[PDB]
């Protein structure tokens, strides 16, 4: 498969990845709430990474997209 940004690499930090699950649970699936809690990402970028998390946690599935490609 293939992956292209056009705009900017924006990735996450251990101290937010543990941030917005503490709020998730405490607050909820309140995107508005968390956001604010940390500060540094928006509900944009928190709304997103919501469903990118849990998609890590599970190994590929629905995707169906493996690393494999060509050998040779």
Do not use: H
Not at 39 to 60: D, H, M, P
Request: proline share 1%; aromatic share 12%.
């Amino acid at each position: 498969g293939s992956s292209g940004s056009s705009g900017y690499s924006v990735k996450w930090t251990i101290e937010e990845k543990e941030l917005f699950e503490q709020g998730l649970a405490k607050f909820g699936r309140r995107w508005t709430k968390i956001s604010k809690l940390i500060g540094s990402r928006t509900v944009l970028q928190v709304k997103s990474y919501a469903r990118q998390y849990f998609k890590n946690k599970v190994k590929c599935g629905l995707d169906k997209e493996t690393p494999n490609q060509k050998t040779g």
